[PDB]
Symmetry: D2
Subunit: 114 residues, 4 copies
């Protein structure tokens, strides 16, 4: 299945944060309605925050996360959870190699804000 794609309510502010855990530099692209809205780049094997920003889901509500390491697309896994019928958290793990920890870049998207 396609992974890393989430439908948000239209015109809604959301947070996106990425963490790195890999010897390789991670490039995390955040596409909102098929346009790049943010790109986080960084290298850490200690869960450093490599980007954290507030974006707007726009008219189409489509948010997609892509992760690559020196031009090679990482394998993604993702899900969305809703807590108290209100707090939405979408999650993306990514694997740049063969050990399958899926933590090489970890991306958290949350809404609503404020």
């Amino acid at each position: 299945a396609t992974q890393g794609v989430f439908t948000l309510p239209a015109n809604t502010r959301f947070g996106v944060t990425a963490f790195a855990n890999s010897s390789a530099t991670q490039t995390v692209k955040v596409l909102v309605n098929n346009e790049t809205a943010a790109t986080f780049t960084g290298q850490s094997t200690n869960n450093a925050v490599i980007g954290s920003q507030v974006l707007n889901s726009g008219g189409g509500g489509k948010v997609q996360i892509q992760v690559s390491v020196n031009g090679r697309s990482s394998d993604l896994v993702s899900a969305q959870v809703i807590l108290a019928n209100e707090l939405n958290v979408a999650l993306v793990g990514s694997e740049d190699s063969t050990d399958n920890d899926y933590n090489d870049a970890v991306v958290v998207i949350n809404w609503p804000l404020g």
Copy 2:
């Protein structure tokens, strides 16, 4: 039910990060095996990171998140998700008031690291 309490594998590094979305200053306490291991304090209505740290689950593996606003405990909601049978993300939402967005402080615990 009790919320914000999670059992981790023993002696495992984990990340804990908190975001704020409230006019009130949030205090997030992280207890590892019933002792305070970190405290984050901060204010944002725009999902700012108010703390992000690497901790160790220790012998007992017990992690508890408590959130308060000027000494009053916030109500919590929480869940843990596992992706690719390996990537663990424990989530806490908290509510300091009456609107029930549960985003006043949002806490993300993730493991494994590295």
Copy 3:
């Protein structure tokens, strides 16, 4: 926090299924827009299905699960998961006593159907 309440898309068929794991007879009430739409009753300590039905979310979309044992409300925990950005599963655990396994009645709500 309130638990066992979920917003579904309006006028959408959904499945609701309950499993029992308790010496006590479980009563599971499914409220759709604040009116009882189904009630399951049954006893098992082996995860037997005590009810499974298809319902319609109606105009309001509001689905609430309540669990009781001979008139006494069990304590509930819940969350909703979305997989492949399309498959929705809402989950309710319940505790009728003191051991906090939260499995005494387990309720699964899923959509879309068909």
Copy 4:
């Protein structure tokens, strides 16, 4: 990423239940520590239960779900959630065609029982 694979605590009873939502007959295989422990077969477009059984995770704790339709592997998505730090629900969605509802067979694994 591989989907439909879950690590359970060793020697623990768990439930596995499958629902069908497709014009095609679904075959769900449950492998426990790499050996076939159950197979459910059925056809429904109305979320009927096509199998529900209690199994034991054995020494290794490895549970894998495979879904096929007339010999062809369906595409899977999955996740595990833990509620109240104790109730575990692993979920599998599957797609046998092109509409990507991922509900064609839906599999719920839960523990602990009793």
